[PDB]
């Protein structure tokens, strides 16, 4: 069908802007037509605090678009449908090889704002493209930035229990299919880390309420340090704790579903593109 | 048996055209009839500027023909016409009996009515696109009055 979506650029684009838009022409980006909220650039603006979860919810709510052609006044781009496929390319400056992986994950770029962006001086907007990366790399960088945020805030509060070089030796590198990448580890990622923290703190009393809902079978599998909490807590506090914990558990589970998960068939490393459909 | 005389009131609707309305003064409209033949979005404007013959300074100059280029916007309106099945089945099988001529005329009437609503919807979408591309390229008066 007719799928060519154009966006309204106010000012004409100069030569270096044309080159920087040509450099990443194969990548995908979301959509809100306005060039102001054209992508993820309104969460990564200097206007809001760079919070991960609102960025993820906006990225999973709104549609995606892979752009085909660039001009001095127009941006030819086709939005994503669940029906057919589009040929997309890996044009991200943190380069992850899409060798034979059947899935691609679309997440906000956690490797720094400058690494995946184009800054438009002449226009009103500074656009960003999300990270399209294979899903074991996606869950691995989620692990190694989540645990690094935890093990960093801990040594900011108390540096007597852990070591910063000990967590930076392992939690700064991912190793998928023999490729060894390095993680730009510097704020960011604090609300997701504290969400996970609240979940694993209130999950003991959650598991106790669940096993008391329906006996020693499910009470043997906790260890002795994982079993003992005293049986005295208020009704309203317990109910609000369970409700807020299950809310954060549902949001955290749908968040560790990595969003719009793209799928690929034929990765051609000579031309750096793969036939990509929405799944 | 005649059993009731019911009175119904059919609504009178004005069917507008783009030439019958009066904002066709603004637009010189043509029948291109195949818009895929023009693939270039940009139309070349050859603005030729005249010259005043100054004899006082004796600084003679031929006409300064400059060229700007301007984009051609394209718009795509789509409405649907709802023709029923049985009336099209009457319309295909042309009858010769003078008792089925009345059913043929009824099928022609309802098919022409649905076609007229579709054509009127298209001629109300033409006027809407013309008003949209007039109001897109219309600056306010408080700037244009002293700018022009």
């Amino acid at each position: 069908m007719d799928l060519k979506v154009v966006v309204s650029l106010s000012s004409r684009l100069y030569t270096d802007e044309i080159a920087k838009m040509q450099q990443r022409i194969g990548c995908i980006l979301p959509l809100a037509q306005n060039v102001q909220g054209l992508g993820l650039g309104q969460v990564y603006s200097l206007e809001t605090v760079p919070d991960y979860v609102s960025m993820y919810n906006y990225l999973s709510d709104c549609t995606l678009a892979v752009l085909d052609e660039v001009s001095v006044d127009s941006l030819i781009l086709t939005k994503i449908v669940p029906g057919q496929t589009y040929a997309i390319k890996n044009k991200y400056q943190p380069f992850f090889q899409w060798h034979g992986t059947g899935s691609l994950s679309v997440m906000p770029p956690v490797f720094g704002r400058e690494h995946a962006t184009v800054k438009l001086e002449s226009n009103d907007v500074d656009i960003v493209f999300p990270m399209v990366l294979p899903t074991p790399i996606a869950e691995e960088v989620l692990q190694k930035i989540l645990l690094f945020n935890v093990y960093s805030r801990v040594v900011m509060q108390a540096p007597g229990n852990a070591d910063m070089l000990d967590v930076h030796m392992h939690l700064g590198s991912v190793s998928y299919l023999g490729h060894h990448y390095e993680l730009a580890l510097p704020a960011l990622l604090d609300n997701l880390s504290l969400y996970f923290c609240i979940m694993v703190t209130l999950l003991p009393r959650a598991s106790m309420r669940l096993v008391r809902g329906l006996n020693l079978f499910q009470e043997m599998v906790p260890d002795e340090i994982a079993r003992i909490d005293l049986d005295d807590l208020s009704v309203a506090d317990d109910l609000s704790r369970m409700r807020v914990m299950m809310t954060y558990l549902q949001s955290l589970a749908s968040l560790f579903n990595l969003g719009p998960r793209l799928a690929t068939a034929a990765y051609s490393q000579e031309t750096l593109t793969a036939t990509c459909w929405l799944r | 048996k005649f059993e009731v005389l019911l009175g119904v009131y059919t609504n009178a609707i004005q069917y507008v055209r783009f030439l019958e309305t009066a904002l066709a003064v603004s637009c010189v409209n043509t029948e291109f009839k195949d818009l895929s033949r023009m693939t270039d979005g940009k139309i070349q404007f050859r603005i030729s500027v005249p010259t005043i013959a100054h004899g006082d300074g004796r600084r003679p100059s031929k006409q300064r023909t400059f060229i700007v280029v301007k984009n051609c916007h394209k718009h795509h309106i789509s409405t649907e016409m709802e023709l029923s099945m049985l009336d099209l089945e009457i319309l295909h099988s042309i009858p010769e009996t003078p008792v089925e001529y009345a059913e043929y005329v009824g099928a022609v009437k309802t098919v022409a009515s649905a076609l007229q609503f579709g054509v009127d919807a298209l001629e109300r979408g033409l006027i809407n696109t013309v008003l949209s591309v007039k109001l897109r390229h219309a600056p306010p008066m408080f700037i244009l009055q002293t700018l022009a």
Partner: peptide
Amino acid sequence: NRGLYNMVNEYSQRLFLEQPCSFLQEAF
């Protein structure tokens, strides 16, 4: 301010807007 400059110089070079009063950033 760049919108005012771009419109005024664009009309000069020739020879879009969401609110008319929005270019003049003064309240009444």
